[PDB]
Amino acid sequence: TLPGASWVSESATEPEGVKPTSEATWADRTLVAEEVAVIIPVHENVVDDASTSLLEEIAALGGQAIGKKLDQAVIFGTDKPSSWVSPALLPAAVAANQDYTIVPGDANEDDLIGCINRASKAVAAAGYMPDTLLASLGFRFDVANLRDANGNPIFRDESFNGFGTYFNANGAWPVGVAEALVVDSSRVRIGVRQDITVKFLDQATVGSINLAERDMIALRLKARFAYVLGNGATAVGDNKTPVGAVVPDGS
Amino acid sequence: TIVPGDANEDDLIGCINRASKAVAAAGYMPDTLLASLGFRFDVANLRDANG
Amino acid sequence: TLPGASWVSESATEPEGVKPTSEATWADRTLVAEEVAVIIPVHENVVDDA
Amino acid sequence: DQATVGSINLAERDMIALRLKARFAYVLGNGATAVGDNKTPVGAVVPDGS
């Protein structure tokens, strides 16, 4: 929160002569590392009889499963661990009224490009520097098919200048919830307490399975991650959210 | 399905784009278009609202 | 089929402290060769006269 | 040195074990021969109590 000045008179007796008091104020926003993990058990003979390097694929698929689970918790609040006090990116924009609904059909001030402009305006008016666009696969196809009132596809050459554009490809992004998020990426941190770490198990008990007596092995995967949003005050005023969203109609 | 008439978000080109969106959103790379003879003449005759 | 991960807590005794097991899976997609055929009979004299 | 084998948790009992294995297969070519079909390539000699 910011302080607040006033105009003042020259007066020894009147209230308007007094220079007023006000306070700045800080808060803390926090990274708390939470653990995301999976075990994949497989038979030791099956691993030996397989034509491909089956353990390299199990490791790579587990790493992808962890990576999806992170995006699902940061972009949406999906299975967000309760120790993350910061709102997830879409819930931040929606709670701030920065979400904007598409008006379908002909190009118009609240079409998809219009809503990306409204989302960018909300973040820039809030005192931040929007620089980053998060969208699904299929977003490039929606800008490319936005016709005008005659039928002409007017946004075929639209490249989003000044934005780094990122497309979620690991299946974290749900259908029918959001088209894109605009964000000042300087106002986020992802804490990587630990990155994807893999242990070969061969003696352990996992679920009901005693690995060694059963001729089984497993690959135990984990990472430790944190997220924080710097949604403080800016030169414009108090309690400003660095995220705007574009959402489908109906929602 | 195509919306017949003047060019629109669901004209023939609009539908090809929806089919491409579906295959891309499924996690594939659409790269091949199959069509009838005469398809070429329908995209060339497709007119906006000014004709 | 893809495997699936979970967020886990730290505990020696409670269920939310145990890491989940899951499975990837593969299936077969198959080429079976099938035959497509025709026979076109014509009179030998018609082939000689053509 | 860490596994559970039977009901023995090896580590907390200070036991150890040696886990031995092999994978073997067998096939008999008891097919047809130039003499005829369903022919067995094995004869046997058996004790007199037979």
mmCIF file with all atom_site columns, all heavy atoms in Angstrom, chain C residues 41-50:
data_model
loop_
_atom_site.group_PDB
_atom_site.id
_atom_site.type_symbol
_atom_site.label_atom_id
_atom_site.label_alt_id
_atom_site.label_comp_id
_atom_site.label_asym_id
_atom_site.label_entity_id
_atom_site.label_seq_id
_atom_site.pdbx_PDB_ins_code
_atom_site.Cartn_x
_atom_site.Cartn_y
_atom_site.Cartn_z
_atom_site.occupancy
_atom_site.B_iso_or_equiv
_atom_site.pdbx_formal_charge
_atom_site.auth_seq_id
_atom_site.auth_comp_id
_atom_site.auth_asym_id
_atom_site.auth_atom_id
_atom_site.pdbx_PDB_model_num
ATOM 1  N N   . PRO C 1 41 ? -13.692 -61.395 -68.321 1.00 0.00 ? 41 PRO C N   1
ATOM 2  C CA  . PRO C 1 41 ? -13.777 -62.322 -69.436 1.00 0.00 ? 41 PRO C CA  1
ATOM 3  C C   . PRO C 1 41 ? -14.221 -61.640 -70.737 1.00 0.00 ? 41 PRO C C   1
ATOM 4  O O   . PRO C 1 41 ? -15.111 -60.794 -70.740 1.00 0.00 ? 41 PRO C O   1
ATOM 5  C CB  . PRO C 1 41 ? -14.739 -63.408 -68.971 1.00 0.00 ? 41 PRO C CB  1
ATOM 6  C CG  . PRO C 1 41 ? -15.680 -62.678 -68.032 1.00 0.00 ? 41 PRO C CG  1
ATOM 7  C CD  . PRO C 1 41 ? -14.807 -61.601 -67.409 1.00 0.00 ? 41 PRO C CD  1
ATOM 8  N N   . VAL C 1 42 ? -13.618 -62.032 -71.856 1.00 0.00 ? 42 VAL C N   1
ATOM 9  C CA  . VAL C 1 42 ? -13.915 -61.557 -73.213 1.00 0.00 ? 42 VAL C CA  1
ATOM 10 C C   . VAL C 1 42 ? -13.745 -62.703 -74.215 1.00 0.00 ? 42 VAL C C   1
ATOM 11 O O   . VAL C 1 42 ? -12.913 -63.585 -74.040 1.00 0.00 ? 42 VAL C O   1
ATOM 12 C CB  . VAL C 1 42 ? -13.063 -60.313 -73.526 1.00 0.00 ? 42 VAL C CB  1
ATOM 13 C CG1 . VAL C 1 42 ? -11.560 -60.528 -73.378 1.00 0.00 ? 42 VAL C CG1 1
ATOM 14 C CG2 . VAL C 1 42 ? -13.350 -59.768 -74.921 1.00 0.00 ? 42 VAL C CG2 1
ATOM 15 N N   . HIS C 1 43 ? -14.535 -62.741 -75.283 1.00 0.00 ? 43 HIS C N   1
ATOM 16 C CA  . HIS C 1 43 ? -14.417 -63.781 -76.307 1.00 0.00 ? 43 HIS C CA  1
ATOM 17 C C   . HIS C 1 43 ? -13.099 -63.688 -77.079 1.00 0.00 ? 43 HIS C C   1
ATOM 18 O O   . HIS C 1 43 ? -12.702 -62.605 -77.491 1.00 0.00 ? 43 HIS C O   1
ATOM 19 C CB  . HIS C 1 43 ? -15.606 -63.703 -77.253 1.00 0.00 ? 43 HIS C CB  1
ATOM 20 C CG  . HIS C 1 43 ? -15.776 -64.976 -78.021 1.00 0.00 ? 43 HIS C CG  1
ATOM 21 N ND1 . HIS C 1 43 ? -14.952 -65.431 -79.046 1.00 0.00 ? 43 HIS C ND1 1
ATOM 22 C CD2 . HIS C 1 43 ? -16.687 -65.932 -77.729 1.00 0.00 ? 43 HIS C CD2 1
ATOM 23 C CE1 . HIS C 1 43 ? -15.386 -66.664 -79.335 1.00 0.00 ? 43 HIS C CE1 1
ATOM 24 N NE2 . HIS C 1 43 ? -16.445 -66.971 -78.586 1.00 0.00 ? 43 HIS C NE2 1
ATOM 25 N N   . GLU C 1 44 ? -12.420 -64.799 -77.340 1.00 0.00 ? 44 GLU C N   1
ATOM 26 C CA  . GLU C 1 44 ? -11.128 -64.785 -78.028 1.00 0.00 ? 44 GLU C CA  1
ATOM 27 C C   . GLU C 1 44 ? -11.224 -64.193 -79.441 1.00 0.00 ? 44 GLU C C   1
ATOM 28 O O   . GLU C 1 44 ? -10.341 -63.455 -79.865 1.00 0.00 ? 44 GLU C O   1
ATOM 29 C CB  . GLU C 1 44 ? -10.548 -66.210 -78.044 1.00 0.00 ? 44 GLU C CB  1
ATOM 30 C CG  . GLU C 1 44 ? -9.117  -66.261 -78.577 1.00 0.00 ? 44 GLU C CG  1
ATOM 31 C CD  . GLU C 1 44 ? -8.303  -67.474 -78.084 1.00 0.00 ? 44 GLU C CD  1
ATOM 32 O OE1 . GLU C 1 44 ? -8.838  -68.595 -77.968 1.00 0.00 ? 44 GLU C OE1 1
ATOM 33 O OE2 . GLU C 1 44 ? -7.088  -67.316 -77.862 1.00 0.00 ? 44 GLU C OE2 1
ATOM 34 N N   . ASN C 1 45 ? -12.337 -64.406 -80.145 1.00 0.00 ? 45 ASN C N   1
ATOM 35 C CA  . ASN C 1 45 ? -12.544 -63.854 -81.480 1.00 0.00 ? 45 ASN C CA  1
ATOM 36 C C   . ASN C 1 45 ? -12.689 -62.336 -81.455 1.00 0.00 ? 45 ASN C C   1
ATOM 37 O O   . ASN C 1 45 ? -12.185 -61.664 -82.342 1.00 0.00 ? 45 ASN C O   1
ATOM 38 C CB  . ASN C 1 45 ? -13.772 -64.501 -82.125 1.00 0.00 ? 45 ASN C CB  1
ATOM 39 C CG  . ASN C 1 45 ? -13.620 -65.989 -82.355 1.00 0.00 ? 45 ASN C CG  1
ATOM 40 O OD1 . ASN C 1 45 ? -12.543 -66.556 -82.326 1.00 0.00 ? 45 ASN C OD1 1
ATOM 41 N ND2 . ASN C 1 45 ? -14.697 -66.681 -82.606 1.00 0.00 ? 45 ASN C ND2 1
ATOM 42 N N   . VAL C 1 46 ? -13.333 -61.776 -80.433 1.00 0.00 ? 46 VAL C N   1
ATOM 43 C CA  . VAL C 1 46 ? -13.452 -60.324 -80.272 1.00 0.00 ? 46 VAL C CA  1
ATOM 44 C C   . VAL C 1 46 ? -12.092 -59.693 -80.015 1.00 0.00 ? 46 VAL C C   1
ATOM 45 O O   . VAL C 1 46 ? -11.782 -58.659 -80.594 1.00 0.00 ? 46 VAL C O   1
ATOM 46 C CB  . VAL C 1 46 ? -14.456 -59.981 -79.165 1.00 0.00 ? 46 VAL C CB  1
ATOM 47 C CG1 . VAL C 1 46 ? -14.405 -58.531 -78.701 1.00 0.00 ? 46 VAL C CG1 1
ATOM 48 C CG2 . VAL C 1 46 ? -15.868 -60.279 -79.657 1.00 0.00 ? 46 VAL C CG2 1
ATOM 49 N N   . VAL C 1 47 ? -11.238 -60.314 -79.209 1.00 0.00 ? 47 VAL C N   1
ATOM 50 C CA  . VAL C 1 47 ? -9.868  -59.826 -79.035 1.00 0.00 ? 47 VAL C CA  1
ATOM 51 C C   . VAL C 1 47 ? -9.061  -59.946 -80.324 1.00 0.00 ? 47 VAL C C   1
ATOM 52 O O   . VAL C 1 47 ? -8.278  -59.057 -80.630 1.00 0.00 ? 47 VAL C O   1
ATOM 53 C CB  . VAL C 1 47 ? -9.172  -60.529 -77.863 1.00 0.00 ? 47 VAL C CB  1
ATOM 54 C CG1 . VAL C 1 47 ? -7.675  -60.220 -77.774 1.00 0.00 ? 47 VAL C CG1 1
ATOM 55 C CG2 . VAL C 1 47 ? -9.816  -60.068 -76.557 1.00 0.00 ? 47 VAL C CG2 1
ATOM 56 N N   . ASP C 1 48 ? -9.254  -60.991 -81.122 1.00 0.00 ? 48 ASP C N   1
ATOM 57 C CA  . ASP C 1 48 ? -8.580  -61.133 -82.411 1.00 0.00 ? 48 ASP C CA  1
ATOM 58 C C   . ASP C 1 48 ? -9.047  -60.098 -83.447 1.00 0.00 ? 48 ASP C C   1
ATOM 59 O O   . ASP C 1 48 ? -8.240  -59.612 -84.233 1.00 0.00 ? 48 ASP C O   1
ATOM 60 C CB  . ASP C 1 48 ? -8.822  -62.536 -82.979 1.00 0.00 ? 48 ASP C CB  1
ATOM 61 C CG  . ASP C 1 48 ? -8.153  -63.678 -82.205 1.00 0.00 ? 48 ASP C CG  1
ATOM 62 O OD1 . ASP C 1 48 ? -7.276  -63.426 -81.356 1.00 0.00 ? 48 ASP C OD1 1
ATOM 63 O OD2 . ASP C 1 48 ? -8.423  -64.850 -82.547 1.00 0.00 ? 48 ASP C OD2 1
ATOM 64 N N   . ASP C 1 49 ? -10.333 -59.767 -83.479 1.00 0.00 ? 49 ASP C N   1
ATOM 65 C CA  . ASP C 1 49 ? -10.917 -58.822 -84.423 1.00 0.00 ? 49 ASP C CA  1
ATOM 66 C C   . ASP C 1 49 ? -10.720 -57.358 -84.029 1.00 0.00 ? 49 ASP C C   1
ATOM 67 O O   . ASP C 1 49 ? -10.632 -56.516 -84.913 1.00 0.00 ? 49 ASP C O   1
ATOM 68 C CB  . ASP C 1 49 ? -12.408 -59.116 -84.586 1.00 0.00 ? 49 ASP C CB  1
ATOM 69 C CG  . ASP C 1 49 ? -12.714 -60.430 -85.293 1.00 0.00 ? 49 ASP C CG  1
ATOM 70 O OD1 . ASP C 1 49 ? -11.812 -61.080 -85.869 1.00 0.00 ? 49 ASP C OD1 1
ATOM 71 O OD2 . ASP C 1 49 ? -13.902 -60.788 -85.367 1.00 0.00 ? 49 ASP C OD2 1
ATOM 72 N N   . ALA C 1 50 ? -10.642 -57.021 -82.741 1.00 0.00 ? 50 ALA C N   1
ATOM 73 C CA  . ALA C 1 50 ? -10.413 -55.655 -82.291 1.00 0.00 ? 50 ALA C CA  1
ATOM 74 C C   . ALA C 1 50 ? -9.096  -55.087 -82.847 1.00 0.00 ? 50 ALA C C   1
ATOM 75 O O   . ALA C 1 50 ? -8.073  -55.769 -82.877 1.00 0.00 ? 50 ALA C O   1
ATOM 76 C CB  . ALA C 1 50 ? -10.464 -55.613 -80.767 1.00 0.00 ? 50 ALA C CB  1
#
